[PDB]
mmCIF file of C-alpha atoms and ligand atoms in Angstrom:
data_model
loop_
_atom_site.group_PDB
_atom_site.id
_atom_site.type_symbol
_atom_site.label_atom_id
_atom_site.label_comp_id
_atom_site.label_asym_id
_atom_site.label_seq_id
_atom_site.Cartn_x
_atom_site.Cartn_y
_atom_site.Cartn_z
ATOM 1 C CA UNK A 1 -36.102 -3.162 240.889
ATOM 2 C CA UNK A 2 -39.355 -1.137 240.837
ATOM 3 C CA UNK A 3 -37.553 2.214 241.291
ATOM 4 C CA UNK A 4 -35.367 1.702 238.201
ATOM 5 C CA UNK A 5 -38.511 1.156 236.114
ATOM 6 C CA UNK A 6 -39.883 4.377 237.554
ATOM 7 C CA UNK A 7 -36.813 6.068 236.097
ATOM 8 C CA UNK A 8 -37.163 4.206 232.805
ATOM 9 C CA UNK A 9 -40.747 5.453 232.403
ATOM 10 C CA UNK A 10 -39.503 8.896 233.447
ATOM 11 C CA UNK A 11 -36.830 8.726 230.756
ATOM 12 C CA UNK A 12 -39.583 8.039 228.215
ATOM 13 C CA UNK A 13 -41.467 11.130 229.410
ATOM 14 C CA UNK A 14 -38.321 13.235 229.265
ATOM 15 C CA UNK A 15 -37.339 12.050 225.794
ATOM 16 C CA UNK A 16 -40.848 11.680 224.391
ATOM 17 C CA UNK A 17 -39.886 8.346 222.888
ATOM 18 C CA UNK A 18 -39.858 4.621 223.559
ATOM 19 C CA UNK A 19 -37.159 3.273 225.848
ATOM 20 C CA UNK A 20 -36.250 -0.424 225.886
ATOM 21 C CA UNK A 21 -34.577 -1.790 228.991
ATOM 22 C CA UNK A 22 -33.522 -5.180 230.255
ATOM 23 C CA UNK A 23 -31.364 -6.477 233.086
ATOM 24 C CA UNK A 24 -30.023 -10.068 233.108
ATOM 25 C CA UNK A 25 -28.372 -11.882 235.990
ATOM 26 C CA UNK A 26 -25.115 -12.977 234.386
ATOM 27 C CA UNK A 27 -24.713 -16.185 236.381
ATOM 28 C CA UNK A 28 -28.234 -17.568 236.012
ATOM 29 C CA UNK A 29 -29.355 -15.722 232.866
ATOM 30 C CA UNK A 30 -32.612 -14.864 234.606
ATOM 31 C CA UNK A 31 -34.399 -11.616 233.715
ATOM 32 C CA UNK A 32 -34.189 -9.220 236.679
ATOM 33 C CA UNK A 33 -36.106 -6.335 235.154
ATOM 34 C CA UNK A 34 -37.460 -5.335 231.773
ATOM 35 C CA UNK A 35 -39.458 -2.708 229.935
ATOM 36 C CA UNK A 36 -40.485 -3.128 226.302
ATOM 37 C CA UNK A 37 -38.240 -6.238 226.276
ATOM 38 C CA UNK A 38 -39.760 -7.599 223.075
ATOM 39 C CA UNK A 39 -40.193 -4.417 221.027
ATOM 40 C CA UNK A 40 -37.835 -3.624 218.154
ATOM 41 C CA UNK A 41 -35.148 -0.944 218.208
ATOM 42 C CA UNK A 42 -32.366 -0.042 215.791
ATOM 43 C CA UNK A 43 -29.118 -1.657 216.917
ATOM 44 C CA UNK A 44 -26.901 1.139 215.661
ATOM 45 C CA UNK A 45 -23.187 0.677 216.451
ATOM 46 C CA UNK A 46 -24.023 -1.841 219.190
ATOM 47 C CA UNK A 47 -24.059 -4.580 216.540
ATOM 48 C CA UNK A 48 -20.293 -4.180 216.236
ATOM 49 C CA UNK A 49 -19.968 -6.451 219.277
ATOM 50 C CA UNK A 50 -21.995 -9.182 217.565
ATOM 51 C CA UNK A 51 -19.946 -8.646 214.426
ATOM 52 C CA UNK A 52 -16.627 -9.147 216.170
ATOM 53 C CA UNK A 53 -18.162 -12.132 217.941
ATOM 54 C CA UNK A 54 -18.757 -13.490 214.439
ATOM 55 C CA UNK A 55 -15.165 -12.775 213.461
ATOM 56 C CA UNK A 56 -13.752 -14.417 216.601
ATOM 57 C CA UNK A 57 -15.965 -17.444 215.958
ATOM 58 C CA UNK A 58 -14.312 -17.737 212.563
ATOM 59 C CA UNK A 59 -10.863 -17.470 214.144
ATOM 60 C CA UNK A 60 -11.784 -20.252 216.575
ATOM 61 C CA UNK A 61 -12.609 -22.425 213.535
ATOM 62 C CA UNK A 62 -9.316 -21.552 211.811
ATOM 63 C CA UNK A 63 -11.025 -19.552 209.062
ATOM 64 C CA UNK A 64 -9.501 -16.198 209.975
ATOM 65 C CA UNK A 65 -6.557 -14.775 211.908
ATOM 66 C CA UNK A 66 -6.240 -11.834 214.296
ATOM 67 C CA UNK A 67 -2.877 -11.009 212.766
ATOM 68 C CA UNK A 68 -4.103 -10.914 209.160
ATOM 69 C CA UNK A 69 -3.310 -7.484 207.714
ATOM 70 C CA UNK A 70 -5.949 -5.821 205.532
ATOM 71 C CA UNK A 71 -5.234 -3.009 203.077
ATOM 72 C CA UNK A 72 -7.933 -0.591 201.931
ATOM 73 C CA UNK A 73 -8.213 2.767 200.169
ATOM 74 C CA UNK A 74 -9.679 6.251 200.501
ATOM 75 C CA UNK A 75 -12.814 5.067 198.706
ATOM 76 C CA UNK A 76 -13.609 2.608 201.515
ATOM 77 C CA UNK A 77 -13.710 5.307 204.211
ATOM 78 C CA UNK A 78 -17.094 6.540 205.436
ATOM 79 C CA UNK A 79 -18.049 9.026 208.158
ATOM 80 C CA UNK A 80 -16.777 8.477 211.714
ATOM 81 C CA UNK A 81 -13.625 6.432 211.159
ATOM 82 C CA UNK A 82 -11.084 8.068 213.516
ATOM 83 C CA UNK A 83 -8.798 5.006 213.404
ATOM 84 C CA UNK A 84 -9.058 3.472 209.925
ATOM 85 C CA UNK A 85 -8.440 6.965 208.522
ATOM 86 C CA UNK A 86 -4.906 6.895 209.957
ATOM 87 C CA UNK A 87 -3.799 3.624 208.395
ATOM 88 C CA UNK A 88 -4.304 4.043 204.652
ATOM 89 C CA UNK A 89 -0.647 3.216 204.077
ATOM 90 C CA UNK A 90 0.095 0.458 206.593
ATOM 91 C CA UNK A 91 -3.368 -1.145 206.595
ATOM 92 C CA UNK A 92 -4.757 -2.807 209.730
ATOM 93 C CA UNK A 93 -4.828 -6.260 211.281
ATOM 94 C CA UNK A 94 -8.146 -7.966 211.977
ATOM 95 C CA UNK A 95 -7.403 -7.488 215.673
ATOM 96 C CA UNK A 96 -6.793 -3.749 215.187
ATOM 97 C CA UNK A 97 -10.028 -3.463 213.198
ATOM 98 C CA UNK A 98 -12.171 -5.153 215.848
ATOM 99 C CA UNK A 99 -10.539 -2.925 218.451
ATOM 100 C CA UNK A 100 -11.400 0.193 216.482
ATOM 101 C CA UNK A 101 -14.945 -0.971 215.746
ATOM 102 C CA UNK A 102 -15.691 -1.763 219.372
ATOM 103 C CA UNK A 103 -13.577 0.689 221.385
ATOM 104 C CA UNK A 104 -13.934 3.658 219.019
ATOM 105 C CA UNK A 105 -17.083 2.726 217.081
ATOM 106 C CA UNK A 106 -15.108 3.028 213.825
ATOM 107 C CA UNK A 107 -17.540 2.659 210.909
ATOM 108 C CA UNK A 108 -15.095 1.632 208.179
ATOM 109 C CA UNK A 109 -13.427 -0.851 210.504
ATOM 110 C CA UNK A 110 -16.892 -2.378 210.802
ATOM 111 C CA UNK A 111 -17.517 -2.407 207.065
ATOM 112 C CA UNK A 112 -14.102 -3.942 206.469
ATOM 113 C CA UNK A 113 -14.981 -6.632 209.025
ATOM 114 C CA UNK A 114 -18.363 -7.178 207.370
ATOM 115 C CA UNK A 115 -16.590 -7.811 204.078
ATOM 116 C CA UNK A 116 -14.437 -10.525 205.671
ATOM 117 C CA UNK A 117 -17.441 -12.649 206.688
ATOM 118 C CA UNK A 118 -19.582 -12.103 203.586
ATOM 119 C CA UNK A 119 -21.687 -9.105 204.558
ATOM 120 C CA UNK A 120 -24.747 -8.237 206.691
ATOM 121 C CA UNK A 121 -26.624 -11.371 205.684
ATOM 122 C CA UNK A 122 -23.807 -13.613 206.962
ATOM 123 C CA UNK A 123 -23.863 -11.884 210.340
ATOM 124 C CA UNK A 124 -27.622 -12.484 210.417
ATOM 125 C CA UNK A 125 -26.950 -16.098 209.454
ATOM 126 C CA UNK A 126 -24.370 -16.372 212.240
ATOM 127 C CA UNK A 127 -27.056 -15.070 214.573
ATOM 128 C CA UNK A 128 -29.776 -17.478 213.406
ATOM 129 C CA UNK A 129 -27.324 -20.332 214.073
ATOM 130 C CA UNK A 130 -26.803 -19.559 217.749
ATOM 131 C CA UNK A 131 -30.566 -19.206 218.217
ATOM 132 C CA UNK A 132 -31.331 -15.499 217.840
ATOM 133 C CA UNK A 133 -34.001 -15.319 215.134
ATOM 134 C CA UNK A 134 -34.809 -11.701 215.890
ATOM 135 C CA UNK A 135 -31.598 -9.680 215.676
ATOM 136 C CA UNK A 136 -30.912 -8.778 212.058
ATOM 137 C CA UNK A 137 -28.409 -6.727 210.132
ATOM 138 C CA UNK A 138 -29.411 -5.723 206.610
ATOM 139 C CA UNK A 139 -27.238 -2.733 205.747
ATOM 140 C CA UNK A 140 -23.705 -1.399 206.025
ATOM 141 C CA UNK A 141 -22.417 1.666 207.873
ATOM 142 C CA UNK A 142 -23.718 4.307 207.879
ATOM 143 C CA UNK A 143 -27.081 3.411 206.245
ATOM 144 C CA UNK A 144 -28.038 1.049 209.084
ATOM 145 C CA UNK A 145 -28.535 3.942 211.497
ATOM 146 C CA UNK A 146 -31.448 5.349 209.498
ATOM 147 C CA UNK A 147 -33.953 4.116 212.082
ATOM 148 C CA UNK A 148 -37.148 4.555 210.049
ATOM 149 C CA UNK A 149 -40.155 3.930 212.342
ATOM 150 C CA UNK A 150 -41.651 0.434 212.031
ATOM 151 C CA UNK A 151 -38.727 -0.506 209.772
ATOM 152 C CA UNK A 152 -37.406 -3.871 210.990
ATOM 153 C CA UNK A 153 -34.077 -3.732 209.159
ATOM 154 C CA UNK A 154 -31.056 -3.457 211.417
ATOM 155 C CA UNK A 155 -33.081 -3.955 214.544
ATOM 156 C CA UNK A 156 -33.001 -6.130 217.644
ATOM 157 C CA UNK A 157 -35.061 -6.569 220.803
ATOM 158 C CA UNK A 158 -33.565 -5.752 224.199
ATOM 159 C CA UNK A 159 -34.218 -9.300 225.397
ATOM 160 C CA UNK A 160 -32.647 -10.822 222.282
ATOM 161 C CA UNK A 161 -29.590 -8.559 222.361
ATOM 162 C CA UNK A 162 -29.148 -9.209 226.086
ATOM 163 C CA UNK A 163 -29.558 -12.971 225.739
ATOM 164 C CA UNK A 164 -27.285 -12.971 222.681
ATOM 165 C CA UNK A 165 -24.610 -10.918 224.428
ATOM 166 C CA UNK A 166 -24.777 -13.305 227.364
ATOM 167 C CA UNK A 167 -24.205 -16.327 225.120
ATOM 168 C CA UNK A 168 -21.223 -14.591 223.515
ATOM 169 C CA UNK A 169 -19.594 -13.667 226.829
ATOM 170 C CA UNK A 170 -20.395 -16.713 228.978
ATOM 171 C CA UNK A 171 -21.580 -19.298 226.439
ATOM 172 C CA UNK A 172 -19.738 -21.922 224.404
ATOM 173 C CA UNK A 173 -20.180 -20.147 221.074
ATOM 174 C CA UNK A 174 -16.644 -18.860 221.582
ATOM 175 C CA UNK A 175 -13.487 -20.307 223.075
ATOM 176 C CA UNK A 176 -12.451 -19.082 226.506
ATOM 177 C CA UNK A 177 -9.719 -17.104 224.747
ATOM 178 C CA UNK A 178 -12.149 -15.389 222.361
ATOM 179 C CA UNK A 179 -14.687 -14.749 225.128
ATOM 180 C CA UNK A 180 -11.980 -12.969 227.078
ATOM 181 C CA UNK A 181 -10.786 -11.070 224.016
ATOM 182 C CA UNK A 182 -14.304 -9.842 223.327
ATOM 183 C CA UNK A 183 -14.886 -8.700 226.931
ATOM 184 C CA UNK A 184 -11.529 -6.882 227.041
ATOM 185 C CA UNK A 185 -12.438 -4.938 223.902
ATOM 186 C CA UNK A 186 -15.770 -3.895 225.413
ATOM 187 C CA UNK A 187 -13.974 -3.061 228.643
ATOM 188 C CA UNK A 188 -11.620 -0.722 226.760
ATOM 189 C CA UNK A 189 -14.575 1.152 225.249
ATOM 190 C CA UNK A 190 -13.401 4.743 224.730
ATOM 191 C CA UNK A 191 -16.504 6.525 223.453
ATOM 192 C CA UNK A 192 -19.257 5.682 225.934
ATOM 193 C CA UNK A 193 -18.117 8.111 228.640
ATOM 194 C CA UNK A 194 -21.386 9.997 229.123
ATOM 195 C CA UNK A 195 -23.619 6.917 229.340
ATOM 196 C CA UNK A 196 -23.405 4.153 231.983
ATOM 197 C CA UNK A 197 -19.746 4.920 232.764
ATOM 198 C CA UNK A 198 -20.591 8.423 234.044
ATOM 199 C CA UNK A 199 -22.760 6.866 236.768
ATOM 200 C CA UNK A 200 -20.380 3.976 237.370
ATOM 201 C CA UNK A 201 -18.558 4.171 240.700
ATOM 202 C CA UNK A 202 -14.848 3.518 241.118
ATOM 203 C CA UNK A 203 -14.167 -0.158 241.759
ATOM 204 C CA UNK A 204 -16.957 -1.413 239.489
ATOM 205 C CA UNK A 205 -16.371 -3.426 236.339
ATOM 206 C CA UNK A 206 -17.968 -2.434 233.068
ATOM 207 C CA UNK A 207 -17.647 -3.729 229.538
ATOM 208 C CA UNK A 208 -19.938 -1.896 227.114
ATOM 209 C CA UNK A 209 -20.734 -0.844 223.579
ATOM 210 C CA UNK A 210 -22.757 2.246 222.756
ATOM 211 C CA UNK A 211 -24.792 3.177 219.703
ATOM 212 C CA UNK A 212 -26.125 6.312 218.038
ATOM 213 C CA UNK A 213 -28.120 6.830 214.958
ATOM 214 C CA UNK A 214 -30.832 8.930 213.635
ATOM 215 C CA UNK A 215 -34.190 10.072 214.868
ATOM 216 C CA UNK A 216 -32.897 10.164 218.424
ATOM 217 C CA UNK A 217 -31.578 6.612 218.238
ATOM 218 C CA UNK A 218 -29.313 5.916 221.196
ATOM 219 C CA UNK A 219 -28.315 2.716 222.917
ATOM 220 C CA UNK A 220 -25.869 0.759 224.970
ATOM 221 C CA UNK A 221 -25.200 -2.831 225.919
ATOM 222 C CA UNK A 222 -23.127 -3.691 228.960
ATOM 223 C CA UNK A 223 -21.818 -6.333 231.260
ATOM 224 C CA UNK A 224 -21.139 -4.709 234.613
ATOM 225 C CA UNK A 225 -20.891 -5.393 238.321
ATOM 226 C CA UNK A 226 -19.196 -4.403 241.583
ATOM 227 C CA UNK A 227 -15.745 -5.436 242.978
ATOM 228 C CA UNK A 228 -14.124 -5.539 239.533
ATOM 229 C CA UNK A 229 -16.325 -8.361 238.179
ATOM 230 C CA UNK A 230 -19.296 -8.274 235.835
ATOM 231 C CA UNK A 231 -22.413 -9.752 237.425
ATOM 232 C CA UNK A 232 -25.239 -8.424 235.254
ATOM 233 C CA UNK A 233 -26.035 -7.672 231.649
ATOM 234 C CA UNK A 234 -27.787 -4.407 230.819
ATOM 235 C CA UNK A 235 -29.327 -3.292 227.539
ATOM 236 C CA UNK A 236 -30.836 0.133 226.916
ATOM 237 C CA UNK A 237 -32.284 1.326 223.616
ATOM 238 C CA UNK A 238 -34.287 4.368 222.599
ATOM 239 C CA UNK A 239 -35.527 5.749 219.295
ATOM 240 C CA UNK A 240 -37.873 8.516 218.144
ATOM 241 C CA UNK A 241 -36.871 11.360 220.457
ATOM 242 C CA UNK A 242 -36.145 14.838 219.098
ATOM 243 C CA UNK A 243 -33.996 15.610 222.138
ATOM 244 C CA UNK A 244 -30.329 16.548 221.800
ATOM 245 C CA UNK A 245 -27.502 14.044 222.159
ATOM 246 C CA UNK A 246 -26.756 15.424 225.632
ATOM 247 C CA UNK A 247 -30.316 15.055 226.842
ATOM 248 C CA UNK A 248 -30.404 11.451 225.588
ATOM 249 C CA UNK A 249 -27.022 10.662 227.116
ATOM 250 C CA UNK A 250 -28.242 12.019 230.464
ATOM 251 C CA UNK A 251 -31.428 9.925 230.542
ATOM 252 C CA UNK A 252 -29.398 6.796 229.924
ATOM 253 C CA UNK A 253 -26.866 7.832 232.558
ATOM 254 C CA UNK A 254 -29.706 8.395 235.032
ATOM 255 C CA UNK A 255 -31.197 4.983 234.349
ATOM 256 C CA UNK A 256 -27.676 3.741 235.065
ATOM 257 C CA UNK A 257 -27.522 5.613 238.380
ATOM 258 C CA UNK A 258 -30.869 4.108 239.460
ATOM 259 C CA UNK A 259 -29.738 0.661 238.322
ATOM 260 C CA UNK A 260 -26.654 1.034 240.521
ATOM 261 C CA UNK A 261 -28.499 2.519 243.492
ATOM 262 C CA UNK A 262 -30.996 -0.341 243.763
ATOM 263 C CA UNK A 263 -28.530 -3.044 242.746
HETATM 264 B B1 LIG B 301 -23.162 3.586 215.060
HETATM 265 O O1 LIG B 301 -24.023 4.093 216.142
HETATM 266 O O2 LIG B 301 -23.709 2.562 214.145
HETATM 267 C C1 LIG B 301 -22.421 4.969 214.073
HETATM 268 C C2 LIG B 301 -21.126 5.579 214.678
HETATM 269 C C3 LIG B 301 -21.314 6.268 216.038
HETATM 270 C C4 LIG B 301 -21.360 5.504 217.195
HETATM 271 C C5 LIG B 301 -21.527 6.104 218.438
HETATM 272 C C6 LIG B 301 -21.578 5.222 219.689
HETATM 273 O O3 LIG B 301 -21.931 5.742 220.768
HETATM 274 O O4 LIG B 301 -21.256 4.021 219.555
HETATM 275 C C7 LIG B 301 -21.643 7.484 218.529
HETATM 276 C C8 LIG B 301 -21.592 8.254 217.370
HETATM 277 C C9 LIG B 301 -21.425 7.654 216.126
HETATM 278 N N1 LIG B 301 -23.437 6.010 213.821
HETATM 279 C C10 LIG B 301 -23.378 6.776 212.734
HETATM 280 O O5 LIG B 301 -22.483 6.676 211.895
HETATM 281 C C11 LIG B 301 -24.528 7.796 212.568
HETATM 282 N N2 LIG B 301 -24.627 8.225 211.162
HETATM 283 C C12 LIG B 301 -24.302 9.018 213.462
HETATM 284 C C13 LIG B 301 -23.087 9.696 213.429
HETATM 285 C C14 LIG B 301 -22.892 10.801 214.250
HETATM 286 C C15 LIG B 301 -23.911 11.226 215.097
HETATM 287 C C16 LIG B 301 -25.125 10.549 215.126
HETATM 288 C C17 LIG B 301 -25.321 9.444 214.307
#
């Protein structure tokens, strides 16, 4: 809708930085609205959805199990790991790790899950396979959030991320069971409160994954819709702003409010 774009361009002004936006009809896959759809942005923690998609794909092929318990040590822990830091003794199941990575944005959980599939380059390989030759992961947490301008490492394009997230949720890449498992994890997101969710009205469905990183990097990917069902895919990225977290959260929220208003 034209008015949402008005707010996207106004978010750019407010943040003094590029904003990438795209809106996909879930059913048809048709682009409803876009802005900088084919420019690169750092993925940040939003890649953790693609990662767990990669893990579920392996489970589908009988190469991994949700119940497999993984043990790790102090030395594996990095910053922001509010779940994996509690289970040094008991370890965690693959399922628990993917939960923590997606619902809590747990960095170590993500690293642990990257180790299971053979690292950043295997996730990028997994991506090339399903037909996304743009989204790339090159580093581990937390180095991937660096967000150096013009640096293409650890970046995606809104239109690629959106299209890729649509394939993972509604495509054949994953079994019905894994598709549902992935969506439920995104639906139980615990840390994205001040983004799209803060504009989301009661009764609406949302499954999302947020991201934060450096140099004002902030993002979110979501499947959402009215009446308790997702009906569109939304991707919002920004990088380069010197604004505070709160200011950046608000601009995203406000894009979300406009998105909802002109649904
Ligand atoms: B991620 O964005 O790759 C990671 C962890 C993180 C995620 C989120 C979110 O909304 O998903 C919010 C905050 C942190 N980012 C970092 O580890 C990054 N170094 C960082 C950490 C704290 C604050 C800003 C950036």
